[PDB]
Ligand binder design. Sequence first.
Ligand SMILES: [Mg+2]
Ligand SMILES: [Zn+2]
Ligand SMILES: [Zn+2]
Ligand SMILES: [Zn+2]
Lengths: 219, 217
Amino acid sequence: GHKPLEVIKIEDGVYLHTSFKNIEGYGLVDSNGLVVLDNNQAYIIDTPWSEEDTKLLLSWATDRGYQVMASISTHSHEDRTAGIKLLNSKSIPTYTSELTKKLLAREGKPVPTHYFKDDEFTLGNGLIELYYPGAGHTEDNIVAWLPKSKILFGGCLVRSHEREGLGYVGDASISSWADSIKNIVSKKYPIQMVVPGHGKVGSSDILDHTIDLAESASN
Amino acid sequence: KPLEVIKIEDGVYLHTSFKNIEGYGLVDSNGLVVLDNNQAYIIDTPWSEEDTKLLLSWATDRGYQVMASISTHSHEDRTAGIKLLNSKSIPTYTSELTKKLLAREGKPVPTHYFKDDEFTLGNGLIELYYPGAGHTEDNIVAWLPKSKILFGGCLVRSHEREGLGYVGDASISSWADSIKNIVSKKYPIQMVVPGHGKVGSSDILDHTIDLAESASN
Ligand SMILES: [Mg+2]
Ligand SMILES: [Zn+2]
Ligand SMILES: [Zn+2]
Ligand SMILES: [Zn+2]
């Protein structure tokens, strides 16, 4: 029994959704995704951490008259993909990279109904730019760039300022992590904000901070 | 990663369980196996029925007879293995309050329970005490007169740490007073074992009170 999904506007047409989980002995932990609006059309970047909170996110959208067009999950882990089954059941198109899809299939988890094969892909016909920069937090982590709001959703490939560790490295490729962040920087996005998969939103600085953590863990 | 087990004194084993929480990291959870000859008593079951079966096999591979388990409160953290020990017909113990709390949530209940604020297990091997609400409304602590160890469970917080943990079921304004009741026993404490984290001295005790006299502020 935890507190419910929270949804708040961080830019024009961009909402941060945050779900929560009780971690006994530690306390309450947060997990972020985004909803991106294109007129009356809504696109979900990473599902909430549970099916129950995914239901609340869909209710949030439909109560405002929005049409949920698609979701994209930025890697295969539960906190990115928990809602995929529910969205599939409502015939809402679900997306991941090809690798992410096949990773889910191997662990016998529900898979998206759609997937992209190349290092770049777009959702909402240019609204959301997706990019695979290399392995880091996981083999398959991708990032999402929003040209209009100039928001980079880094997911778990990036660490908030409040953290001085990489977090869960069980599926990680630490010696590749720093290079993967560098690849994002090389894209030369005019980043105004970076949204992490956990913790507070920040600036371009998050990338440098993440590179420091990666290079420390590998040394 | 799989269950771990560690000698921390003659006749006292620390068992630590782990499980992957996707989206944050790996968590640990502590309990004890206390021995009287070949008779073993478990303080808090591991976090899973799997790890509990592993903990049982650890005991029976060494010829130990598992006499009973005690759970320090009703959270799955501490009672996950009750139904297994029940199925294996091994006596399971909690406070009466913890038992009633488990029945209401429709979760497995222990076969045994004590009704007072004090209760002794083994033949003096383990002294149980209910100091009042803190982590939960029902949390109890276990004192080991021989090893002079106090198992604090989640009613206590290691340092190497902060943040009283999950306080959803907590009585934060009651916490500090509950901890002081444990000091009232004047147990010749030389060691404290928290439900999570590292093993410490009688300092872990005073530390936990600072956090309660701070969250209630
Ligand atoms: Mg991928
Ligand atoms: Zn992850
Ligand atoms: Zn995550
Ligand atoms: Zn608890």
